[PDB]
Structure 1
Amino acid sequence: VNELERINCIPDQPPTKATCDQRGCCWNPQGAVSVPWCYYSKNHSYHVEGNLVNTNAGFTARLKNLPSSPVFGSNVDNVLLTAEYQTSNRFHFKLTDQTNNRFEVPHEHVQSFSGNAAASLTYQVEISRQPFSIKVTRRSNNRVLFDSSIGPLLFADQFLQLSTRLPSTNVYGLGEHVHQQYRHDMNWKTWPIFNRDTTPNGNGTNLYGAQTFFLCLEDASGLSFGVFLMNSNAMEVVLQPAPAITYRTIGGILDFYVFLGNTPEQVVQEYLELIGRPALPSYWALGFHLSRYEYGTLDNMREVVERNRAAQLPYDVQHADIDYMDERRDFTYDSVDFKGFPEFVNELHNNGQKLVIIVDPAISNNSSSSKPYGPYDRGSDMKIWVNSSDGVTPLIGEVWPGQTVFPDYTNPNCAVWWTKEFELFHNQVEFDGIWIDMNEVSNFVDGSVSGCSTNNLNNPPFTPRILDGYLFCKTLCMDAVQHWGKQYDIHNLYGYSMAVATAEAAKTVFPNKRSFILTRSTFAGSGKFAAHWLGDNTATWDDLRWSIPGVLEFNLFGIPMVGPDICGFALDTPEELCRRWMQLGAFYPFSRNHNGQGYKDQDPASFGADSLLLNSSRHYLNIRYTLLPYLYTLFFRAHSRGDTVARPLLHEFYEDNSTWDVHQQFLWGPGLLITPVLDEGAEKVMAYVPDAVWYDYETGSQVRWRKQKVEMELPGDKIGLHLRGGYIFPTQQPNTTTLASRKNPLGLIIALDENKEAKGELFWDDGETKDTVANKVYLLCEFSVTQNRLEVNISQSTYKDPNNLAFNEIKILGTEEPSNVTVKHNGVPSTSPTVTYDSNLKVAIITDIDLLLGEAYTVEWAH
């Protein structure tokens, strides 16, 4: 045995020979660090009994256990393998108890498969019988993608395990964690997954969400595949240098999906097709958001709002944290410190801004006849709470307002209660979106106010390496009871179910609008309902650096609208760190400056009306807003096709192995390269310039760099922004809110490639109505440039913006002097455009032009 292939047979304790012998494993302490001293033997697990049986969907096999006696609970003697050739690029297999029904995730989007095995498979599946293994290979080149033969299948009631070899160490995904790097280097590492309120720091613990998907770039040709495990039980994922990955879960079933694609982007598309593509956001939600924990008073909140508006900061959304509530209670505001809250919301709305309020799941149980609490009263009447293990008494915990009960969002009647609570609150306070927090679910006591009973759910035979080492730590008892089942099985689905419910609520509170939902806890598929933020970070340079892989990973997960708390939640932020964080933060898909209780102000204007931080912030936010039609079109593609929005370099440049672990840079879509300074004291960054033509966004000049590391010079007031040759970027003159910006002239930036060609597109709809894509009420155009000619082509035209919008400026990068510029509208010349040329920089700008949005044009020139 090569020691890098050993599968650890004592994951639970320090290795000893007595235990090894007792478990039938192999003993060989003579390895390197982390190499398992005790590991599974070549032949001792399951075997196929009899023949495989062809089915309409695929095949089944009966697997039978070669007798080994109880280690982590009751073992499953007879396992059923069910395999389905669901599509040409998606393989599904599950391992279940032949004789007993077990918990299976009640996912809201994923459906059971009916009908027939797909034609034209890109993959082939091979099963071995003695012992059992399953292998998925790519048909085109026979590359083995999934191969469980490296280790056993373990299948006990509370311990299920399967391993697979991997064809490369280009592995990305898993969550929710702070991985620090984007690529998993595959040296020995265990990642626990169990939704938990915990700090995203350098310790690598389980965090708020549960995301089992990973993507593997097989080679430089771009060929890639992905694996997803549909299991909501506590689990851990073990990486080793074979290279190989092992999934080790303490409940449910092994329900796997394998996705193949020609590019990493196609693997993401295949995954999102299964689990659900992200919601198209409200266009306003792409603006800058400002927030903090404890303004304390409305007067304080208004002062912050007003100084940032005074500074002309692009600034669409104000969040209001639990300090707006009457004693941290949902669906109230503090009639004293937040006296006049309704008038403030009118002021926000009148300035074209939006209000997002925090809502916690936990409901105060403190209600009397003297002092009634309506949400508790109504929730109790409807009987919609999570119950203790008796199945009838609501479970009591403790969160912000004190003792609380917790909504059971898995019960359809709960969402009716939840909706009515929001419709009543909204009559008082006209919020525009909802921030759901503390939904792991997070509890200030362990399990409940009376703790947890000792039993196999609260105290299982095996516990993954979760923070604090008990399942019920800072959450509900594992034997608590909900409509979908016991908390042991569905704990990881609480935040998911809460987002589903909250989205159901938005149907009523915000009729036919998308609104905005931001969630802390997530499961696979939560991006269909909500944005995400990366949680309670800290104002340190480490946190700044760690933000990028977090953003990228959530994009792979189909939650593209993601960002951290810009400047850092915990701690006073240093000015230089906040300045570099706001530069980068202008380019996070979800851009929010948020701050913890007590710390100094970190809103941009608090640094001074004439500070470099404010100046720089406003400069880069105005760039963000200029480019919002490009960003919005990227979200349209994420929603309708499944593309990422914040994208790793390797997704566009996989042919170049220098891009495979770049994590200090990223792209917006295919064309915009963002290079932040992420080091204290630095005025340069060490960056990689991929193999393309690149133009400096601000000046339009073509960089000398191509396919190389560079020291990019970036002074206190600069972040690197380069546009890729071959791409056309739609823009719109910025303003301080998107309500206003969306009325402005549009522009095109044409970044020419080596052949003087470029392509791009623009999606445009009303920016807020739900189902504009489903109901095909939108504009989609395509731009293409070939040497002497720009064509504006209209592929869908069922929305005409009433603001009479037009392209009034075209900037061409990397061009020789155009001359004789002519504009035609469906063939008819022409109106005679002004052209300015910079011969040194090779930039042409065409003005005094009026190309109506939604109309076909040709713009032609000579050299």
Structure 2
Amino acid sequence: VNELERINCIPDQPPTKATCDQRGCCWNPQGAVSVPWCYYSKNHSYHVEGNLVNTNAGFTARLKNLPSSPVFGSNVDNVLLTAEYQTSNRFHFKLTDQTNNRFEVPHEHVQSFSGNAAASLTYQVEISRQPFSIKVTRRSNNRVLFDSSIGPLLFADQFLQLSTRLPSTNVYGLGEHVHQQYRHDMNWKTWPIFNRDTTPNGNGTNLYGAQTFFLCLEDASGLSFGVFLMNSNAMEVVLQPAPAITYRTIGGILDFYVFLGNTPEQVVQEYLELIGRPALPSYWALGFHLSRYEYGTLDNMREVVERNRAAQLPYDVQHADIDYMDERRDFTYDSVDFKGFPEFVNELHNNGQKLVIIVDPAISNNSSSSKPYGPYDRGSDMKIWVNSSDGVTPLIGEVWPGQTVFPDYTNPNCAVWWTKEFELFHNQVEFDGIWIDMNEVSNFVDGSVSGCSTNNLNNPPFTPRILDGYLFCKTLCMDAVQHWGKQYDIHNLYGYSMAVATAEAAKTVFPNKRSFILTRSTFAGSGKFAAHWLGDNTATWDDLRWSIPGVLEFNLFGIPMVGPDICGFALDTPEELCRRWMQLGAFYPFSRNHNGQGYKDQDPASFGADSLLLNSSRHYLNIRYTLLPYLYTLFFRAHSRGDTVARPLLHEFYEDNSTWDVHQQFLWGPGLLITPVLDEGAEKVMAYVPDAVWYDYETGSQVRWRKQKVEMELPGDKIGLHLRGGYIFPTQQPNTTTLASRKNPLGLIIALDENKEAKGELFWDDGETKDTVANKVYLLCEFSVTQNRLEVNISQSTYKDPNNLAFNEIKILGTEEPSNVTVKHNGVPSTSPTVTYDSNLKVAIITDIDLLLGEAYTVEWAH
């Protein structure tokens, strides 16, 4: 046996022969570090009984267990395999108990499959019977993608395991963790998944959300595939250098989806087609967000707001953390320390800004006739709390306000209760969006105020290697009861159900609007309802570096609006770290500076009205705002098609194996390469320049570099930003709010490829109405240059912006001098525009031009 293919048979304790012999496994302690001493024997597990049965969707098989004896509880001796050829590029199979129904994730988006197996499959499926294995191979080249034969199927009531071989070590995904790198190098590694309030640090623990999806790039041709496990029980994913991946969960069923694509982007698209594509954000939520834990008082918050406005910082959103509340209680504000809160929200709104308020799931149970607490009284009347195991007494835990009950957002009535709470509170404070925190769900006591009973749910046969080693640690009892089921099965779905309910509440509080929801805890599909932030990081250079894989991974997961706390939540931030972080932060899809309680100010203007940090921050935030039309269009593509927004180099440059492990750089979509300085003291970064034409964003000049590692010179006020030849970038002259910026003239940056061609697009709608896409109320146009001609072509034209918008500048990069430029509108000339040419940089700027948005034009020149 090859040692890299040994599947660990003692995942639960240090390995010993006595245990090994007792489990019927193989013993060989001679291997290298982490190679399993005790591993499963070749014939251990299930076999197919009888024949496979063709069905309309695919096939079923009956699986039978070769009689072993209990290790992690009751074995399931008769297992049903059901396989559905759902689409040409999506395969679904589940392993269930033949004789008993079991817990299955009640996903809000994924539906059951009905009717017939798809035509023109890109994959073929093979079943072996003695012993059972399942294999999925790519038809075009016979590449084995999924292959469970490396290990057994284990299917006990509270221990389910399946492994698959992998065709490469280019493996990306799984969460929520701090992986540190982007590519899983497949050395021996276990990643637990169980939603938990814990620090995203170098310890590799389970964090706030649960994401089983991974993507595998098979080879340099781009051919890629994805695997998703639809399971919400505590689990761990085990990676080894075979290469192989094992899923090990403590409940539910093994419900697997396999996705094939021609490129990594197609895998992501196929995955999001199944679980749900991300919500199109409000355009304002694409601006800069400022926040902190404990301004303490409204005067303090107002002071920070005011110094940043005085600095002319682009700055759309102010968040209000739990300090705004009356003693940290939802749906109240502090009438002393936040006296005049409603007038402040008026001032924000008058200045074109928005207010997002934090809300916690926990509701104080402290209500008397003397002092009534409305949210608690109303929720108690509606009977919408999580109950203890008796099924009828609301479970009591403890969070910020003291003893608390927790809403059962899996109950449709709880969304009606929650909605009414927000409508009532909105009458007092006119917030614009909602930040849902602590929704793992996070509890200051273990399980409940009376702890947790000793039983198979709170104290299961096997516990994955989760932080602290017990399931109910800093959360609800596992035998707590909700409408969807027991906490043991649905713990990982709490924040997901909270996002669903909060979206539902927004249909009433902000009629017809997207608003903005930011969530901490997620499950697969949470991006349909919410943005995400990476949690309570620290102001260290390690945290800055670790943020890039975190953002990339959440883009795989369909949560493209994701970012960390810029400058670092915990700790006072050093000026140099915060300056570098603000430079990079300008380019996170979610861009928020947030700071923990008690630490020194880290809002940009706190560093000084004429500090290098403030000047640089404003500079790069203005570039971010200039490029918002391009970013917004990327979000349109994420929402409508399922493309990523922050994109790894490898998704565009997979033919080049030097991109496969790049994680210190990333792209906005296909065209914009972002290269931060990420090292303390550094004024350079070692960077990779992919195989394309690149132009410096600011000067427009073509770099000499191509398909090579470079030492990019980046002084204290610089981040690397390059535009890819072949792409046209729509821009809008910036201002300090998107309310104002959206009224400004537009521009095009044409970055020419080797053949002097480029293409691009622009999506434009009202920026706020929900379902402008489903209802087809938008503008979509396409730009294409070849090679003495720009064509502006209109493809969807059901929104005309009443602000009279037009392109009034075209920048062309990598071009010989354009002469005698003409503008035709629907073939009719024409107005003669101004052209400025830099012969040294090879940049032309066309100005004194007025291409109305939503109209077709041709712009021609000669050389």
TM over 0.5: yes
Aligned-residue offset at 1:720: 0.1
1:345 deviation in Å? 0.2
Residue 795 (structure 1) aligns with: 795
Q: How many angstroms apart in 2 are the aligned matches of 1:658 and 1:374? A: 59
Mapped partners of 2:403, 2:696: distance in 1? 56
1:115-174 superposed Cα distances (whole Å, 9 cap, x missing partner): 000000000000000000000000000000000000000000000000000000000000
Deviation (angstroms), 1:266: 0.1
Provide Cα deviations, 1:824-853, integer angstroms capped at 9, x if missing partner.
000000101000000000000000000000
Partner Cα distance (1:828, 1:140) in 2: 49
The C-alpha deviation readout for 1:744-763, integer Å capped at 9, x for no partner, is 00000000000000000000
- Distance of 1:599 and 1:395 partners within structure 2: 35
Question: SS state of the match for residue 51, structure 1?
Answer: coil
CA shift, 1:24, in A, is: 0.1
> C-alpha displacement at 1:217, in angstroms?
0.1
Match of 2:818 in 1: 818
Q: State the partner residue of 1:126.
A: 126
Match of 1:335 in 2: 335
Inter-partner Cα distance in structure 2 for 1:73 and 1:619 = 61
Deviation at 1:215, TM superposition (A): 0.0
1:712-765 residue CA offsets vs partner (Å, 9 max, x unmatched): 000000000000000000000000000000000000000000000000000000
Shift of residue 239, structure 1, vs aligned partner: 0.1
Q: What does residue 558 of structure 1 align with?
A: 558
- Write the distance in 2 (CA, Å) between the matches of 1:674 and 1:816: 27
Deviation at 1:287, TM superposition (A): 0.1
| Distance across 1 between alignment mates of 2:503 and 2:226 | 29
Q: Name the CA distance, whole Å, in 2 between partners of 1:691 and 1:401.
A: 56
1: CA distance, partners of 2:601 / 2:482: 41
Q: Once the 2 structures are TM-superposed, how far is the Cα of residue 448 of structure 1 from its aligned partner?
A: 0.4
- Structure 2: gaps (5+ residues): none
Alpha-carbon separation, structure 1, partners of 2:96 and 2:855? 56
**Distance apart, 1:534 and its partner CA:** 0.1
Instruction: Tell me what 2:620 maps to.
Output: 620
Q: What corresponds to 1:634 in structure 2?
A: 634
SS in structure 2 of the partner of residue 467 of structure 1: coil
Report the Cα distance in structure 1 between the residues aligned to 2:668 and 2:454, rounded to whole angstroms: 50
State how far apart, in whole Å, the 2-side matches of 1:831 and 1:514 are.
41
SS in 1 for 2:579: helix
Write out per-residue CA displacement over residues 418-477 of structure 1, whole angstroms, 9 at most, x where no aligned residue. Answer: 000000000000000000000000000000010000000000000000000000000000
CA distance in 2, matches of 1:691, 1:837: 27
- Give the TM-score, by structure 1 length: 1.00
Distance 2:746 2:33 in 1: 59
Question: Helix, strand or coil: the match of 2:735?
Answer: coil
Instruction: Please list every run of 5 or more consecutive structure 1 residues that lacks an aligned counterpart in the other structure.
Output: none
CA displacement 1:202-242 (0-9 Å, x = unmatched): 00000000000000000000000000000000000000000
CA distance in 2, matches of 1:592, 1:379: 33
Q: Describe the superposition over 1:559-593 as per-residue Cα deviations: whole angstroms up to 9, x where unpaired.
A: 00000000000000000000000000000000000
- Find the aligned partners of 1:298 and 1:821 in 2 and give their Cα distance: 56
Per-residue CA deviation, residues 17-51 of structure 1 (Å, 9 max, x unaligned), is: 00000000000000000000000000110000000
Cα distance per residue 1:261-280 (max 9 Å; x no partner): 00000000000000000000
User: CA offsets, 1:756-785, max 9 Å, x none?
Assistant: 000000000000000000000000000000
Helix, strand or coil at the partner of 1:434: strand
Deviations 1:287-340 (A, max 9, x none): 000000000000000000000000000000000000000000000000000000
Cα deviation, residue 531, structure 1? 0.0
Q: Which residue of 1 aligns with 2:221?
A: 221
- CA drift of 1:13 comes to 0.1
Paired residue secondary structure (1:344): helix
Aligned equivalent of 1:706: 706
Q: Any runs of at least 4 consecutive aligned residues in structure 1 with deviations exceeding 2 A, and if so which?
A: none
Distance of 1:149 and 1:181 partners within structure 2: 29
Q: Distance in 1 between matches of 2:352 and 2:229?
A: 43
Name the SS of the counterpart of 1:469 in structure 2: coil
Residue in 2 aligned with 1:117?
117
Tell me how far apart the structure 2 counterparts of residues 705 and 449 of structure 1 sit (CA, whole Å): 62
The separation in 1 between residues aligned to 2:93 and 2:384, in whole angstroms, is 35
- Report what 2:406 is aligned to: 406
Within 5 Å, give how 1:304-323 maps onto structure 2.
304-323=304-323
Q: Which whole-Å deviations, capped at 9, do the CAs of 1:788-847 have from their partners, x for residues lacking one?
A: 000000000000000000000000000000001000000000101000000000000000
Whole-angstrom distance in 2 between the partners of 1:44 and 1:660: 37
For residues 612-635 of structure 1, give each alpha carbon's deviation from its aligned partner in whole angstroms, at most 9, with x where no partner exists. Answer: 000000000000000000000000
2: distance between equivalents of 1:513 and 1:252? 37
Query: Does the alignment pair 1:26 with 2:26?
Result: yes
- Residues in 1 aligned to 2:334 and 2:375: alpha-carbon distance in whole angstroms: 16
- State the alpha-carbon separation in 1 of the partners of residues 593 and 644 from structure 2: 23
- Alpha-carbon distance in structure 2 between the residues aligned to 1:208 and 1:592: 18
C-alpha separation in 2, matches of 1:323 and 1:778: 40
> Secondary structure of 2:495's match?
helix
Q: Secondary structure at the match of 2:415?
A: helix
The within-5 A match list for 1:336-351 is 336-351=336-351
Query: In structure 1, the residue corresponding to 2:453 is in which secondary structure?
Result: coil
Shift, 1:675, TM fit:
0.1
Q: In structure 2, how many angstroms separate the alpha carbons of the residues matched to 1:538 and 1:392?
A: 42
- Name the CA distance, whole Å, in 2 between partners of 1:464 and 1:584: 35
* SS at structure 1 position matched to 2:781: strand
What residue is the counterpart of 1:212 in the other structure?
212
**Any idea what SS the aligned residue of 1:265 has?**
helix
TM (norm. structure 2) is 1.00
Q: CA deviation at 1:666?
A: 0.1
Distance in 1 separating the partners of 2:179 and 2:60: 37
- Residue 643 of structure 1 deviates from its aligned partner by 0.1
1:429 lines up with 2:399 in the alignment: no
Give me the whole-angstrom Cα distance separating, in 2, the residues matched to 1:838 and 1:854: 30
**The residue matched to 1:145 in structure 2 has which SS?**
strand
Distance (Å, rounded) in 2 between the aligned partners of 1:725 and 1:537: 36
Secondary structure at 1:468 match in 2: coil
CA offset digits 1:494-524 (Å, max 9, x no partner): 0000000000000000000000000000000
C-alpha distance in 2 between matches for 1:498 and 1:659: 38
Question: In structure 2, what is the equivalent of residue 605 of structure 1?
Answer: 605
What's the CA shift for 1:858? 0.1
Deviations 1:687-734 (A, max 9, x none): 000000000000000000000000000000000000000000000000
Q: Distance in 2 between matches of 1:716 and 1:20?
A: 58
2 CA distance for matches of 1:635 and 1:155?
Answer: 41
| SS class of match (2:216) | strand
CA distance in 2, matches of 1:143, 1:500: 39
How many equivalent residue pairs? 863
What is the DSSP-based 3-state SS (H/G/I as helix, E as strand, rest coil) of the residue aligned with 1:50?
Answer: coil
Partners of 1:209 and 1:281 in 2: CA distance = 21
2:588 equivalent in structure 1: 588
Q: How far does the alpha carbon of each residue in 1:181-215 deviate from its partner, in whole angstroms, 9 at most, with x for none? A: 00000000000000000000000000000000000
Superposition pairs of residues 415-494 of structure 1, within 5 angstroms:
415-494=415-494
Secondary structure of residue in 2 paired with 1:71: coil
Q: Distance in 2 between matches of 1:637 and 1:512?
A: 21
Secondary structure of 2:20's match?
Answer: helix
